[model samples]
Target: AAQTNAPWGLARISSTSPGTSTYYYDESAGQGSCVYVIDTGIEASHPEFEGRAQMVKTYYYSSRDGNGHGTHCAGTVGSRTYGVAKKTQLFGVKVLDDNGSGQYSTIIAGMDFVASDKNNRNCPKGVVASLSLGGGYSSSVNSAAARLQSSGVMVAVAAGNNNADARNYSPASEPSVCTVGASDRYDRRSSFSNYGSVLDIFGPGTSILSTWIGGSTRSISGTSMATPHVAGLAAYLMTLGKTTAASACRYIADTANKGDLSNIPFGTVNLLAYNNYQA
Candidate 1:
C-alpha cells in the first residue's frame, strides 16, 4: 500500500524544514512490539486499525469507545492510516468514561491492569503504554505509572494542556515517565501545551489528523495528541533492542532533534521527536 502524501504530523517528525513532505520509516520498525492506549477505549473494528487494535480491559463504562479520545491516541500510535508504528499491535485499556473523564482511582486501576499484563505476558521487543489524559498532581496516579515502569512497561504521558509548567500535573511530573509536550507544523510550541523541564520531548500535536470514533477520522490539538507520537516512536525504538524502559527513553532523547523548535520556554528542553528514518 502507498499513500499519496504524508500526513503533516508524520512528515514533520521525519524531516527538517525545506524537505519533501513524505514520510520514510523502516518496514520492520514496529515488528514484535505492542502499544497500550490507556484512555477512553479503542474501537476494535475501526477501519484505521485494520484489526490490529483490541480492548484488553475496561475499568469504567465499557469496551466500546463512546468517547473518541482513546481511538485517536491509539491511531497515532499505530493506525494504518495515521500511525507512527503501523506494524505494532495496539491494546486499549479503558480508564475513562464516555465523556472522556474518569476518577483517579479508575485511572490507577487501568495502569494496574497493564502492569499485570506486562508481568504475565511475553512481548519480546517489550510493551509500552501511551496515556493521553491528565489532571492535577496525584500521588496515586504518579506512583502507578512508576509501578508500571518498573514492572517492564514503558510509560509515555501527556505533559498536559494547561500551557503552564508541566511540573504541576500528575504522570507528567512523574520522574520515570516520558512526558511529552505539543508542537505545531511550523515547529513552534502549541499555544496550549504545557512546558518546563518535566517535558521529555515534543511531538507534532497541532491539527493532528488521526483515527476517530465510528471508524472515521478527525483533527484535534493538545498535548494529549503529542504523547502518543512519542509512544509510537518508543515502540519503534524498542524493536531495535532498546528493550528496557530506560533504554528506550534514552534512545528517544538521544535521537531527537535538539534546538530545532521555536518559542520553547527558557527552561524546557527543546528536543523534537524524530524517527531517524532517512529517505
Candidate 2:
C-alpha cells in the first residue's frame, strides 16, 4: 500500500500552531485503537488517563509505575490533554524495573506478550507497542520486533539518547519498527538524539510535559520521550482504518513534516523525521 496524503493523528485531539485547530477532547479520537507502553510501567490512576489505562504484568510481577518515566510516556501517547491518541486504550507493560532498568530478555518477553492475541484481551484488532528504551544491538530484541510487525502489531522504539548512530542499538536498529529520534520544540533535532539511516521518525522530545508519577506532571527529555508521539500516531491511524502495521509506518514517514533538522549527519536522507499536527 502507498502512503496516504491524509492528516496524521494528534491533530484530531490538539494542535500547537495557528494553522492547525485543536479538536478539544473528542470522544471518538481513538475509540477502537490500543497501545502498549513497554517501559517502566504506568500509573494507571493518573487522572489524565481517565481510567483508560490497564496495568498488565510482563517482565515484572507488578504493572504499577514507580519510576515516572512510563507514566510520562504514556501521557504523550494517550493522556487526555498531552497525548496523540487521547482515547486510545493504554496497556502498561512493565519491561523495565522500578529503577528504569531491564535486560534484553525482559524486553523480548514483553514484546512477545504484547504480540500474543491471548494476552491482549481488549482492543485486539491491533496494538501499537511504544518502547522508550534501547541499548546495544541485540539480534534477539530485533527479532522480537520483527515478529510483532509481521503479526500486525505496530512497534515504535526510541533511537537511543547517545547522539550516535542508532544502528548500534537494538530495537532502534531493528527493522520494521518505527525507530524514533528526538526533535525539540524549535523543530531542530535534539543535540543528544541518535541519528542515521536507521531512524524512522523524529518527534517532540525536548522538555515535553506530560503526566507523571505521584499524580503530578513534569517535563523531561530524551529520544525515549519522543517515541510515544509516533506510537500514539500509529494507534490513531489504526482507528482511522489503517490496520496494517506496514501501512501505518509508511504513511507516517511519507506525510511527516520534513527538512527542519540541524546537526544531522550527511548521506542519511531517510533519517529525517519532523512533524507538526496541522489538519
Candidate 3:
C-alpha cells in the first residue's frame, strides 16, 4: 500500500487527561514531531520530560512564572509520554508574566523569534508550532503568520477556550492560522469552547490529561489542549511532505472520516475521523 494507508485518525474529543493512557482513543500514541510551545515557562527537568524531550530554545520575555500555567501547558504540548506528540520537542517561550497575563508585544516577539531563527531553529529539520493562548488579534501577527506560511511552516492556535459566540483575535482569529476548538468524549463541542465559522476544527480539550512540571499530574480544561493536538497532526503531515499550514489543514479537514458532525455528543471528539487524513 505504499504511503496509501492513513497515518492517523480524527481528533479525539474527550475529557481524558493526556497524562494517563486512558485519555484518548485506542490508537497508537504519536511519534516525535518538532514543535514549538510558546507559553509562560516549563520545569524542563520533570520526570515526564526526561530523555525524550529536547529544548532548542527557551525565552523569558516576562519576569514572572505565572503560577506554572505555562509549564503545565508546555508539558501537554510536547513533553515526554504525557504528550500526544510525546516524541515531539518543545521550545519554551515565556511570554506571560507571573500574574498569568502579558502584553501583546511580548507574544509577538516570541513568535517572531520562532519563525526566523536560522542558526538556532527550535524544531528538527522540519517542524510546526502550537499556540494555545489567545488575546488581541493583530494585523502584524497575521502578517507574521503569512510569512511563516510562505516559509513552509505552520501554526495552530486555540479558538479561545471561552464560551464566546464569536472568535477572538491576534492569532486564532487570523485567516491564515489553524483555529482549533474543544470537544468532549463523544466529539461534541465543549461548553467552554468558542464556536465560530472561522474556527477550523475541533480537538480533545475537556478534562485533558497532560504533563505538569516538577513530576506532578493535572487535568486542565481549555481549547489550549486542542490547539496542540492539531499542531501534532501538522507535524505528522510534515512527514508526508505537507509543509504549509493551509495544505496540512486541508489534509486534516478533507480527509476527516466523521460521517456526521451533527451526530457527535458534547464533551467528545471523534478521533476516528482523523484516521483518514494521514498523508
* TM-score of each predicted structure versus truth: 0.96, 0.87, 0.76
- Residue range 31-125, candidate 1, lDDT tens digits: 77889999999988998888889999998547989999999999999998688888888999989999999999999999989989865555678
Full-model lDDT for every candidate: 0.86, 0.76, 0.58
Question: Counting only residues 3 or more apart in sequence or on different chains, how many pairs clash (N, Cα, C under 3 Å) in candidate 2?
Answer: 0
| Per-residue lDDT over 128-220 for candidate 3, one digit per residue giving the tens place of the 0 to 100 score | 667777876677766665565555566777777667633456577776777777765545567888767667677666766666655676777
- By TM-score, how accurate is candidate 3? 0.76
Ranking by TM-score: 1, 2, 3
Mark the regions of model 1 whose C-alpha exceeds 4 Å error after superposition.
1-4, 18-20, 120-122
- How many steric overlaps does candidate 1 have? 0
Consecutive 10-residue window with the lowest summed lDDT within model 3:
1-10
User: What C-alpha lDDT does candidate 2 achieve relative to the native structure?
Assistant: 0.76
lDDT-best of 1 and 3: 1
In candidate 2, what are the lDDT values of residues 1-279, reduced to their tens digit? Answer: 111221222332233331232333334556678888999998999999999886776567677887999999999888887787888988889999999999999889988888884254567445788899999999999999888777777889999999899999989998688888887755567888888888877776677778899999988998998898888877776676654566777777776665655566774433333233334
Model 1 lDDT, full chain set: 0.86
Top candidate (TM-score) = 1
